[PDB]
């Protein structure tokens, strides 16, 4: 007569894309739409029990989250878990729910290892995955003549979820799985100046197609030093792996988009540097249902969660929790419709997998592995204004690169520079 | 009126040094000695509740062990946990018991990260630590003129606890913490023949003082190939990081000790190769209480556990559980003696830390960090007979290298070769 959904997310810290202050209203919207639909679980009253994944300091925890999962499991026996979104929170909870034979839904947990569904059985990811970033990079290389060598620079902050490590791992493993080209990698520490000589030297010795996962300021400073040392778009291309668009404003307003602009009199130098720089992000959903969802999410979060949902790419995470929850209620109702129960985890999960669905994020495909295909945008500088705009778009389900608004990806030489220089790197 | 001890170890798989078939009788011996001592917990009846750290396939598990820890915690509210010894079992249980404010004792879990007692609070290790291996290697280098460059080769089996990784991590971090010399490292796969050209090439390009953590057969084959390629004791020294003496028989009988002997017609070549090879192991405890403990352990395991405890270095793990348990009961009795309770985890723990103790393993010192100091032996070949024997001994508490039975560490050149060759490595 009722369905129990266990939630393990940050219930108090609101800094995370998958924080409850932002995912909670998106879930309330989805439950309200289940209630208003007589074709989704008719008569059932979907209940929710919460568990905080964060530790005493407030950050998401590889200890608080699995403990919280055990509390909810023995106290309520839920049929499904929602979250966590942090990799180190999600990995132990995922192995518990795999062992409990209970499905788990999350728009977070994008790490490569969560994709091993023999271990993380009945885990369904409805948000981005870092192997899907490797798909986009693969298509980008094939559609650009780079079939030899790339370099990857990544940095994290000690004690975080290591977002850049896992991004680079997904890219690294999938790209070499599909292209088997040489992918050099190097980790640095953003606040450590000793590394910038080492990085700049490694840039001019280990690659010309260069991906950097870092903070906006680190990517900016690296660009400034690359210009100062005479590394221009004729020989080098610097991709910033800024999947949540932290270096860009939202697609709603704030026209135009300038990541190199900081207000330190360096902006003049930064623009000429960023002529060699392109930014890879998740794709903003186009469909008008998304914009209406955003308006309703903002209202419900301010009313029931005392939180203000600003615009930006991070909102695709609450939107995907929304969509994944509805995609699950459909599967339960279909499982009930053919004689199943709400605890037929494997039956429910296989109805969700290898399946296309329509949600507030538009078209969303869960692949054979249980992971949503992820679309990416590619931002590029308009050489006239200096502002960045989407010029390429990647459909994750079809793996096609389509130009955007008839734009051209800017090259100082008229075409992409070679991934390997003339007479070697020497 | 009674003390509850929770155990999380392999209850069914007997392949592990810390398996219950081998630790259980060592713990029964320790409980029986608590009963017979009126100065240790007078009147208390220490009970034990067991929990298996192993999964359905029988191997120790990052999921079974923490679940078992939660099951025992809510069912019995124990005052202390015993085990696990696997690194990936012990880390999640360690973080639970730190959060529960419950002391944890183990003779396993030797990984570098378990040493961060800010996270693994109230974790006390009474067996070996891999940073202590770095202490021995440090003393070995200081006492031999190697102050520049070493090379470390390590290999694991996919799906195990990664023993060689964690051994090499402990050595790598501690050695560079104390000597800051260049420590090159390279991982390989033992069954993959593609790696042996790469390894041999990397041996003659990245170091002359070479540590190899691998199976005996891999270390043997690597030696045969190094002789076949003309790498002898005049320029190279190959340490086998065989902490449990897997490549050697027990110190009880089986005289003499020959690791290069295999019976494949290669034994004649292997002996000349092993002239460049030395083996690092844990130190066999000397004291006669150990030998008496071994006899009682073998009897009690055959009687109550249907298991046959063979002789070897692996028996220092059950002996250290034994000693750790007595060291804990002493500390509880001392805490009760000054008005404390059995749940004053922090008071109990600090009585155990920075403390010397006498157990069946002889002299054992828990350092300031809560980790037992670890003694190492160095085995070397007698050029006349060809058999290996202990020639150097390291006292972990005093960090002294003492020659053993007036033996001389064999060198084909009369002294250790330089860690860097003549005119560079080229």
């Amino acid at each position: 007569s009722d369905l129990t959904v266990a939630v393990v997310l940050p219930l108090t810290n609101t800094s995370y894309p998958w924080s409850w202050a932002r995912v909670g209203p998106a879930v309330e919207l989805a439950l309200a739409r289940v209630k208003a639909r007589p074709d989704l679980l008719p008569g059932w009253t979907v209940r929710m029990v919460l568990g905080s994944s964060e530790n005493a300091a407030g950050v998401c925890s590889d200890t608080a989250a699995p403990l919280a999962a055990v509390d909810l499991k023995w106290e309520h026996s839920p049929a499904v878990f929602l979250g966590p979104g942090c990799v180190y929170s999600a990995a132990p909870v995922g192995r518990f729910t795999a062992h409990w034979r209970v499905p788990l839904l999350t728009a977070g947990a994008p790490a490569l290892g969560i994709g091993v569904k023999d271990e993380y059985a009945l885990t369904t990811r409805t948000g981005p995955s870092h192997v899907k970033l490797g798909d986009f990079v693969t298509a980008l290389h094939r559609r650009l003549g780079w079939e030899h060598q790339a370099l990857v620079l990544y940095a994290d902050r000690l004690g975080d979820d290591r977002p850049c490590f896992f991004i680079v791992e997904g890219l690294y493993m999938r790209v070499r799985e599909r292209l088997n080209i040489t992918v050099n990698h190097q980790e640095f520490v953003e606040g450590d100046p000793d590394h910038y000589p080492k990085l700049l030297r490694a840039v001019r010795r280990k690659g010309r197609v260069i991906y950097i996962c870092s903070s906006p300021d680190a990517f900016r400073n690296l660009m400034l030093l690359a210009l100062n040392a005479g590394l221009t778009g004729e020989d080098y291309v610097f991709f910033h792996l800024d999947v949540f668009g932290q270096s860009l404003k939202s697609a709603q307003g704030l026209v135009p988009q300038k990541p190199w602009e900081r207000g330190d009199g360096q902006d003049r130098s930064a623009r000429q540097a960023f002529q060699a720089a392109k930014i890879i992000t998740y794709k903003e959903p186009d469909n008008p249902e998304y914009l209406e969802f955003l308006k309703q999410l903002k209202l419900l979060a301010d009313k029931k969660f005392n939180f203000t949902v600003e615009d930006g790419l991070k909102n695709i995470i609450p939107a995907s929790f929304h969509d994944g929850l509805l995609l699950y209620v459909q599967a339960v109702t279909e499982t009930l419709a053919q004689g199943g129960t709400v605890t037929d985890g494997e039956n429910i999960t296989q109805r969700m997998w290898n399946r296309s669905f329509q949600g507030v994020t538009g078209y969303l495909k869960i692949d054979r592995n249980g992971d949503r295909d992820t679309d990416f945008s590619l931002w590029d500088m308009d050489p006239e204004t200096g502002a960045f705009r989407v010029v390429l778009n990647y459909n994750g389900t079809s793996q096609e690169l389509m130009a955007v608004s008839e734009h051209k990806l800017y090259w100082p030489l008229g075409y992409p520079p070679p991934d390997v220089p003339k007479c070697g790197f020497d | 009126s009674d003390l509850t001890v929770a155990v999380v170890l392999p209850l069914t798989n007997t392949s592990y040094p810390w398996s219950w078939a081998r630790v259980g009788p060592a713990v029964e011996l320790a409980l029986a000695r608590v009963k017979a001592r009126p100065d240790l917990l007078p009147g208390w009846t220490v009970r034990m509740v067991l929990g298996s750290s192993e999964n359905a396939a029988g191997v120790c598990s990052d999921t079974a062990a923490p679940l078992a820890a939660v099951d025992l915690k809510w069912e019995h509210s124990p005052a202390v946990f015993l085990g696990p010894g696997c690194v990936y079992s012990a880390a999640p249980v360690g973080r639970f018991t730190a959060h529960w404010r419950v002391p944890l004792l183990t003779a396993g879990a030797p990984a570098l990260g378990i040493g961060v007692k800010d996270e693994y609070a109230l974790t006390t290790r009474t067996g070996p630590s891999h940073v202590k291996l770095g202490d021995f290697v440090t003393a070995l280098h200081r006492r031999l003129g190697w102050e520049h460059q070493a090379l470390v080769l390590y290999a694991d089996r996919l799906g195990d606890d990664r023993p060689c990784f964690f051994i090499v991590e402990g050595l790598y971090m501690r050695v560079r913490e104390r000597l800051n010399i260049t420590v090159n490292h390279q991982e390989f796969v033992e069954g993959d023949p593609d790696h042996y050209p790469k390894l041999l090439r990397a041996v003659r390009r990245k170091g002359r003082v070479i540590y190899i953590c691998s199976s005996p057969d891999a270390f043997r084959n690597l030696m045969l190939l190094a002789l076949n390629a003309g790498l002898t004791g005049e320029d190279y020294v190959f340490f086998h990081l065989d902490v449990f003496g897997q490549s050697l028989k027990s110190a009880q009988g089986l005289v003499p000790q020959k690791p290069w002997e295999r019976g494949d017609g290669q034994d004649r070549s292997a002996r000349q190769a092993f002239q460049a090879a030395k083996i690092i192991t844990y130190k066999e405890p000397d004291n006669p209480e150990y030998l008496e403990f071994l006899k009682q352990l073998k009897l009690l395991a055959d009687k109550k556990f249907n298991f046959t405890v063979e002789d070897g270095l692996k028996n220092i793990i059950p002996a250290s559980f034994h000693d750790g348990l007595l060291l804990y009961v002493q500390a509880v009795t001392e805490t009760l003696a000054q008005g404390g309770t059995v749940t004053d985890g922090e008071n109990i723990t600090q009585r155990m830390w920075n403390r010397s103790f006498q157990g069946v393993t002889g002299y054992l010192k828990i350092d300031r960090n809560g980790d037992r100091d670890t003694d190492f032996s160095l085995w070397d070949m007698d050029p006349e007979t060809g058999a290996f024997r202990v020639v150097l001994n390291y006292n972990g508490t005093s960090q002294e290298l003492m020659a053993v039975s007036e033996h001389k560490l064999y060198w084909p050149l009369g002294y250790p070769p330089p860690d860097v060759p003549k005119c560079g490595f080229d």
Partner: peptide
């Protein structure tokens, strides 16, 4: 497989890299 990437998800196997190319640690 990989020397740096693919090795489980636990902060215990991320205390030194040791397969990785890093300027820290």
């Amino acid at each position: 497989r990989s020397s740096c990437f693919g090795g489980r998800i636990d902060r215990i196997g991320a205390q030194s890299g040791l397969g990785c190319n890093s300027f820290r640690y």
